[PDB]
Amino acid sequence: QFAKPEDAVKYRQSAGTLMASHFGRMTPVVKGQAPYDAAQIKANVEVLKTLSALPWAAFGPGTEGGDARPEIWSDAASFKQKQQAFQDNIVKLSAAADAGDLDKLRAAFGDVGASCKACHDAYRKK
């Protein structure tokens, strides 16, 4: 869907921006600094679920640029493992949110955040 590689870069960066907001806005809730409303969090994690499927198709052939490392493309199976594992982490977060289970939410949130960081550390330029 991208006329030029620059359009794929713009897309995936914007998807990252929105994920960061929908993930990070739950930090105070996980920490107990903000109240836990199970329905609010369930709805927010749904949004995050949708968003977290979006970046990967915007690292398609010819879309090199931004702060994306070349290794994304030369090691396609390995990058794919990391995005699929991340989306698995999001499923765990969704399950926790859908159940209304705050302890589960805390734990799953930590594992999601670790997965974001592990991919950035390997595949995003500093």
Show the site string, 86-115: x = touches ligand HEC by CB under 6 A, - = not. Answer: x-------------------------x--x
Residue 46 amino acid letter = E
Q: What is the 3-state secondary structure (H, E, C) of 40-55?
A: HHHHHHHHHHHHHCCH
Site string for ligand HEC, 48-87 (x = CB under 6 A): -----------------xxxx-------------xx--x-
Phi, psi of 68 (to 5 degrees): -85, 125
Contact partner, 47, from ligand HEC, its own copies, none, Cβ < 5-8 Å per class = its own copies
CA 35 to chain centre: 23
